[PDB]
Amino acid sequence: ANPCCSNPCQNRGECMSTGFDQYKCDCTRTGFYGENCTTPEFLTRIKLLLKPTPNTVHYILTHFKGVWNIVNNIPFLRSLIMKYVLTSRSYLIDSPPTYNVHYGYKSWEAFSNLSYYTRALPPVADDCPTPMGVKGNKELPDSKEVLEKVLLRREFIPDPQGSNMMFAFFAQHFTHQFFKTDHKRGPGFTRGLGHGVDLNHIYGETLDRQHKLRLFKDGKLKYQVIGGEVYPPTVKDTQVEMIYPPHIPENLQFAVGQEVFGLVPGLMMYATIWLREHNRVCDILKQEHPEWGDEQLFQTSRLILIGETIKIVIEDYVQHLSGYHFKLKFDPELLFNQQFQYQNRIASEFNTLYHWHPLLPDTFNIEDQEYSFKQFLYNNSILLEHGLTQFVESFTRQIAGRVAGGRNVPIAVQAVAKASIDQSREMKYQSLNEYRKRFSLKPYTSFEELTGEKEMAAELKALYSDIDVMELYPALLVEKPRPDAIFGETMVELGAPFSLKGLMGNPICSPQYWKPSTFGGEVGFKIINTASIQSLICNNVKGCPFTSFNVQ
């Protein structure tokens, strides 16, 4: 009934009803005009004609390694390319944020209420005749059939990009600080009110939780010693709320910033490494500042670890995921002469696209053991038995699964994979093709073009009928991957703007924060600017084992 249900306005123009059966498009600053913002302005025609496709740019970034090696060794040129990457990606994100699951129009409620995930595209109005607007059937296809026919894993499909389990558990640990859905309200709501990289999964979301986790000496976090090794403290010693099954003994109820991290030893691995890193930075800062008290030691160490996190995510994590021969760079100064908002609001679609269920392997291969999901889950004695060193060595060697390409969701996680489909519908997500246009991607014109094959495409056509009704989340998992890549075009072109915006949107990247005195001096500043996944593990894991996000 709503005259905007068909999503008529193009090129990020906004639809506003003007009566019961008429609409008008606001084409302000879109670069276009006309009834649906489809007539390009003169300068828009030139910029569009000169703009290369994401696949063309992806090819250039993944080839000509000898040329990129020269480029990487020219600091001025490396900075200029990285600056263009940051600025062009950030242009795709609305900042200040706009819509959420309850507001298809801008409102002070949607702007100011931090409990919502924000929305890159407004929800489909409730009075629209079909779930996607006006196209398709009155009901989307059975999400169980979509799951079984093109999503469930037959044989384990390894990631051709070589992503390992160190990567997989890092992805899970890192994103669990800003993907913290509050299901008491619904899938469109979050408990991560910081909306970014605040390391609340280490320090706690609230001051009360943080204070129970702190030792209040030398700025350090509380800890225990098990077999001569440093581990997070117990629930009994700290009285912080954690989530554990009723069979876990008290001496195995670890207390960490995130309440679910005790449920998987892979997450407890990173929680232990990062706790050690904080206390290690406390020792360094204390040696630099014997006059400092516990409070300043704690706060300064936290700012350093935030910087270390962003450094590693850009130059190791995103570097690996991109597959680029160009060496990415974490340099907040690249943005000092640019227009950029040092703020971030986590998008629901960023959460949805990050449901990388196919990453999970069939078993968890630690040393000579191959643990099942039931044997591995909730059994933190596996970490204490093999030790942190053996965990790093094993998970660096174990290959993870391919996310794109379809039919790679392990059957053990069927229920949560189906919930990812259903929650998108609960939040009235627009279609895949609307999200592709939102991020300057050509809409798919068939299911065979989406998948690059015929078998899964035919299954999807029988279920969805029209490619313009295909849903965003299952499309991401079945999409044709880039050559020998883990992802397809839609994952990267949506995930990259959200990622980089969330990373550089942090206040420590703002000019008044990005200075040595913020981090205790040049010694603390250098900890950020030399950080890497390899140095993180080397400084905090006995024996300094080799590690990376790629199998060697």
């Epitope: 913290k180 859905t181 299901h183 989530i243 679910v260 949560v416 259903d422 939040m427």
Partner: nanobody, 94 residues
């Protein structure tokens, strides 16, 4: 952790933020499946796709619900994520 206590009621308490899906199950002589997600998606057994539909009172943290229906009805809560825990209540004649 989430505690479920049954009593037309399933009173829930604890880590309610983690529960993506609530469910009613019944079981003399297998356990069979109403479910409602945190977003309101409802599924039903075909045999029961008639009377008693499921609903949740978010303010009260309570989930509400022929002689063939004689069974022990159990309340269930499923947690988010592939690692999520399953919770079951304590559970009676027509």
């Amino acid at each position: 952790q989430v505690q479920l206590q049954e009593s037309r009621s399933c009173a829930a308490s604890g880590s309610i933020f983690s529960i993506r899906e609530w469910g009613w199950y019944r079981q003399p002589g297998q356990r069979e499946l109403a479910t409602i997600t945190s977003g309101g998606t409802t599924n039903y057994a075909d045999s029961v796709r008639g009377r008693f539909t499921i609903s949740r009172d978010n303010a009260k943290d309570t989930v509400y619900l022929t002689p063939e229906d004689t069974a022990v009805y159990y309340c269930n809560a499923e947690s988010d994520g592939w690692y999520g825990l399953s919770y079951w209540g304590q559970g009676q004649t027509v």
